[PDB]
């Protein structure tokens, strides 16, 4: 929003700033004579709305760890501008706690922030004002570079045979594997060390050092990216579509008492 700065020096009737604004833009006699029309309510926190949203809340306001979080400095903004903030926050925190109390060894937590939004135009992914130098280390990398190419069409464009594109010689050799193991007297050859793409699993999670070896606990922060122009979400293995529709219905049913007394005009 806006930070008024020093309220004291701007409340005076006659000010250098007001006269400069009159001369150049932003102020005029219409404000000195008719403040109720051109200043009116002004822009600022709405104490009455904050009180209403606070007193409409359930006991969730007591059981939420919000006031100790680093975002506690935004309490009034979110209480005023996010009806039903405390109940939703309590559900969010209890969801995190129940994921934490799971029986799975890896606890995945969804993370959504300003970067979680995709875009077809590259200038929309930068912070404003844009940095002086952008894409210094090359441009984007497309995930599609890791998909198998259209072999048939590629052969066809060049006027090559491409008859046996799907028929390949079998390969059974010890020279083709670098990862060798001995498992109960059996020497198993399987796989080749590729490099940075073979260690994605460990580099993505952080261990709980106090958890024993027979009951490991790992914490993983799964980032989420969405288009925001799609209207349909497909979480994959993390959340089934039927469960998501159920959650939508329940969320819209519970968060209705906080929304029904207001009009959108």
């Amino acid at each position: 929003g806006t930070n008024p700065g020093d309220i004291a020096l701007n409340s005076k009737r006659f000010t250098v700033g007001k006269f400069v604004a009159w001369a150049c833009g932003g102020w005029g006699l219409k404000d000195w004579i008719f403040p109720s029309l051109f200043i009116g309510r002004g822009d600022g926190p709405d104490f009455d709305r904050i009180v209403k949203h606070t007193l409409q809340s359930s006991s969730a306001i007591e059981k939420v760890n919000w006031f100790d979080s680093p975002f506690a400095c935004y309490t009034e903004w979110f209480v005023e501008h996010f009806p039903g903030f405390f109940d939703s926050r309590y559900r969010f925190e209890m969801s995190a706690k129940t994921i934490l109390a799971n029986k799975y060894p890896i606890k995945d937590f969804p993370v959504v922030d300003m970067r979680s939004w995709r875009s077809s135009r590259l200038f929309d992914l930068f912070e404003v004002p844009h940095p002086e130098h952008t894409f210094v280390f090359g441009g984007p990398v497309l995930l599609n570079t890791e998909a198998k190419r259209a072999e048939r069409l590629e052969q066809e464009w060049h006027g090559k045979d491409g008859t046996f594109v799907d028929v390949h010689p079998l390969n059974v050799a010890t020279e083709s594997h670098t990862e060798v193991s001995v498992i109960g007297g059996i020497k198993v050859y399987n796989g080749v060390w590729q490099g940075g793409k073979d260690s994605w699993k460990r580099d993505s999670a952080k261990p709980e050092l106090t958890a024993p070896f027979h009951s490991p606990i790992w914490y993983r922060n799964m980032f989420i990216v969405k288009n925001a122009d799609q209207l349909v979400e497909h979480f994959g293995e993390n959340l089934s579509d039927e469960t998501w529709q159920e959650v939508r219905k329940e969320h819209l049913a519970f968060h209705e008492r906080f929304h029904k007394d207001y009009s959108f005009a």
Binding site: D108, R115, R118, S119, S120, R121, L122, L125, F135, V136, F137, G138, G139, P140, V141, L142, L143, N144, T145, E146, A147, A150, R152, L153, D166, G196, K197, W200, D203, S204, R220, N221, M222, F223, I224, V225, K226, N227, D229, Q230, V232, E233, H234, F235, G236, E237, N238
Partner: protein, 116 residues
């Protein structure tokens, strides 16, 4: 001509696709350590996802991200292009880990210039 090509075998009915929570799409960019990676789709990894134009993404490095447009899990990650100062003093024969150890220690602790 591609949309009417056949699958090769019945594996796709049993295996785990490329882009699963256990078999993600790992991709590699170049840059500075910790810098967010720019990645993207060409669109239409799903029937309900747009396909008109490429859709870009900004993601933290070395973390499991999920596109909830298509449902694909990916591992954009960064590899820094640290290379010998190209002034003619590059080594012509196999080099060992000592001098490289010193240079890498200095780069990690303080950083190195950019080839611009």
């Amino acid at each position: 001509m591609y949309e009417d090509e056949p699958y090769i075998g019945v594996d796709h009915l049993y295996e785990a696709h490329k882009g699963s929570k256990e078999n993600p799409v790992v991709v590699e960019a170049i840059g500075v350590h910790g810098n967010d990676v720019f990645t993207g789709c060409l669109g239409g990894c799903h029937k309900d996802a747009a396909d008109a134009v490429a859709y870009y993404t900004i993601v933290p490095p070395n973390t499991l991200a999920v596109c909830i447009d298509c449902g694909i899990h990916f591992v954009a990650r960064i590899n820094e292009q640290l290379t010998f100062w190209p002034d003619g003093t590059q080594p012509w024969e196999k080099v060992d880990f000592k001098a490289v150890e010193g240079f890498l220690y200095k780069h990690y602790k303080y950083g190195s210039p950019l080839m611009i």
